[PDB]
Each structure stands twice: as structure tokens, then as C-alpha cells.
Design a protein around this ligand. Sequence first.
Ligand SMILES: CCN(CC)c1ccc2c(C)c(CCN3C(=O)N[C@@]4(CCN(C(=O)c5c[nH]cn5)C4)C3=O)c(=O)oc2c1
Lengths: 215, 215
Amino acid sequence: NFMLNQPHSVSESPGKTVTISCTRSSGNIDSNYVQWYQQRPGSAPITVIYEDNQRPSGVPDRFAGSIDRSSNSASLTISGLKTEDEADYYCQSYDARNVVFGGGTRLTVLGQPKAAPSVTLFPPSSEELQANKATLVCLISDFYPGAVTVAWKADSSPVKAGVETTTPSKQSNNKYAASSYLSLTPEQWKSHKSYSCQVTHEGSTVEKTVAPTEC
Amino acid sequence: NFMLNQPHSVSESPGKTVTISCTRSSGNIDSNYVQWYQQRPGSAPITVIYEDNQRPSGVPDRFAGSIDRSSNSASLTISGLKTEDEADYYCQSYDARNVVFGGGTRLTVLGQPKAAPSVTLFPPSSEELQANKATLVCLISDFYPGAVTVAWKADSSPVKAGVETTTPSKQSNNKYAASSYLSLTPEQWKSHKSYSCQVTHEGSTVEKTVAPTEC
Ligand SMILES: CCN(CC)c1ccc2c(C)c(CCN3C(=O)N[C@@]4(CCN(C(=O)c5c[nH]cn5)C4)C3=O)c(=O)oc2c1
């Protein structure tokens, strides 16, 4: 029985090299294979190293596994650091009576560039209106950092009720996405000339407007 | 190689028994050992079962591994459910050097009543069409537990490319919301008769369809 000790957290800027150590508490690091897993928030882990230093297909060659018997440790070295590398990393080995994991290392990539959101506003569908409901959705994607504020307008007037905005989550392009949705009656929707969603990100506001459409 | 297919989510109340299955797509489940890993949100993985049914020391006998050759499946059974059992559970096996992980099952220990999601599917906005974009958005609101899986269809064909789903977040009504969006070209969107959003939650799959037109 042994533990694998990892740093709690490491931070580095893009294009730099970072090293994550994994020290075996008891027994020799080289008595069993060390694996490394990467996990992005809200995703399942992916293997980036097995058998100490082997990369599965799809893993970039920027990921290098090594063993240092003299410090009884394994290391994951990431060269040419990219923002997609921001994640939790877990080392793992074998006891014969167990698969044991490190406590994990949070890798922060500093100085990721600002990215203004794409904002798309969807009016209620004919189908939804037929079911006596009216929802607007303001889709907000491709933004960094992951903080927006949203204000809604009925004509020019502030909407103060029926608004929800999801907590931004990092998507596969490593920029944030969220939706703000406004629940209306069909009568409220048809009573105004338009509704607007105003998304503020890092001091800049993007406004979209939709209106009831005749045929 | 093969896949290990787990249900996306399971739930129960404290003190109850829940089973998580793991079906091997090809080859015999008993040809190779099955392991089970627990990952509590914001924690490192831990092994709860190795070699089909062995418990590492420290793992309570509330956790039980089994093999069903009949269904070519493994199962984890957790009895006496406690709130600390809320976690993602992964099964894992191999054929020679190919290591295969299951997709993971979210186990929720119910803190509040179950709630089926409202699903609203939006066709592309006129404005975005004139920016050469045809994003579809599937809003998913008012659900508990906070675990959903979304699958998209172009006519009758599963879509893979261009799907993004946000991590479910708890809104002001203490229920979860998320959005799945499919980033289409206007030509992709018009080249099909319909697209469909399939949302799976707590033993049910709801479906919504949208189609092109002018109005
Ligand atoms: C919490 C438990 N846990 C331990 C960290 C997980 C959980 C799920 C996963 C999942 C889902 C994947 C992704 C899918 N996938 C596999 O099922 N197998 C590989 C392909 C081959 N591989 C190997 O490790 C491998 C192949 N020859 C030797 N080793 C990982 C893979 O990418 C993965 O790679 O690693 C996982 C690890």
C-alpha cells in the first residue's frame, strides 16, 4: 500500500514548459507502470501517457512522460503550453491489490486572450406559440474570460422578471458558452414591437433585437 | 477493440440500492477483468472494484461488483446509498494492450424531487442567416437531477460535428438549465428536410424537430 503525491496546482504562460511530479510514498516508482490522465471541467478524463512514457493516438507529442528513480517520482512535462492544456492532471499506478491515483494537479494557463462573445437571439417558434408558451433564447458563445452580464428589453423598457442566465461553461474551442432565456406568455410577446438581449463582456455591450413576424 | 456502454445517469434516495451496468459491445465480458472507479465532483478518482468484484481495503462492502455473461455486462451495486456516493462511476477492461473505459454514469443521491426537462428547439434566426450562419439551439430547463445527454439528427442520421452542450447550472428555481447548439451553414440547414434534438433524462428521451420555411 502506497500513495502518489502530486502538486495541488501549477501555473504557466502559453509556449512555456511545465512539469508535474508524482512521488510514490512507499515502494519503488519503477516497480509498476505510471499513467497520466487529463480532465477538462465537465468532461471525462483522457489518457495522455501510459506505460510511463507512451502516448495513445491523438495525444500531441508536447506531452512527455518520464521516471526519476533517484527522487522515486514520475513526471508529466508539457512543452509549448497551449490554452487547451488548462485542466486537472492525475498520475496513476498499480499496487497488485489496487489501482491508485494521485490527488491531481490543477494546471492554469495564464494570459489567455480576450475573446468577445458571438450573440444570437432566437424568437419563440410558431410550434411553441401553438402550445401557449413563448420563450426567447440569447445564445452567447466563443467568449473569454467566462463572465457576462445580460439585460433584456421589452420595446425600450427594462424586463425585470422571467430572465434566467446559465453559468458560463468552457466548450471544445476552450472559450465559454451560456444562454439567457426569457419566459413570456404569447400575449406579452405579441403585445410589444420587439424584445432585445444586451450582453456585456469586459465593458463592451452587444445588443440583438427580434420582433413578432407576420406571413 | 470494443466499447463499454454505461447509462449516462442513475439516481436514488439515501438508504436505497442502485445498480450501474457496463455492456461490452464485442468480445466476452469474462475474457478480461473489469475495474470500477468513483470520481466525486472536484475530487481525484478512486478504485472501488478491481478484478470484477474485489474491494480495495477501505472500500465498504456497500459496493459490490458482478459479471452477467448472459447480457455480456458488468454491474456496480451500491446499497445503503449515502450522499457522499454522489459521483461519476466508470467501468474499465481491456483486450491485450487496448485499455477500454466506459463513458461514465452520474449517480445522483436525490436532494429534491425529480423534474423532467422542458425542451424548446429553435430554428435559425433570420439575422444570423444573413451572416452565413444557421445555428440551431435546444434549450433544456427546469430539470433535476442536473444530468442530461443530448443527441442531434440531420433527418434520420446522427450528427457528430458542430454539437456543443453547456454544463447544466442551477437556476433561481433550484432546477438545472443547459443549451445544446448545432453550428450549421445555411446550405447544410436547407440541404435537409428536418433536424431533431433528443434529450435523455432519468429513464426518458424527449425529441423535438425543426424544418426550414420563410416567415
Ligand atoms: C475516472 C476513471 N478514469 C481514470 C482517469 C477514466 C475514466 C474514463 C476515461 C475515458 C472515457 C477515456 C477516453 C476513451 N479511451 C478509452 O476508453 N481508452 C483510451 C484509448 C487507449 N487508452 C489507453 O489508455 C491505452 C491503450 N493501450 C494502453 N493504454 C485510453 C481512450 O482514450 C480515457 O482515456 O481515460 C479515462 C479514464
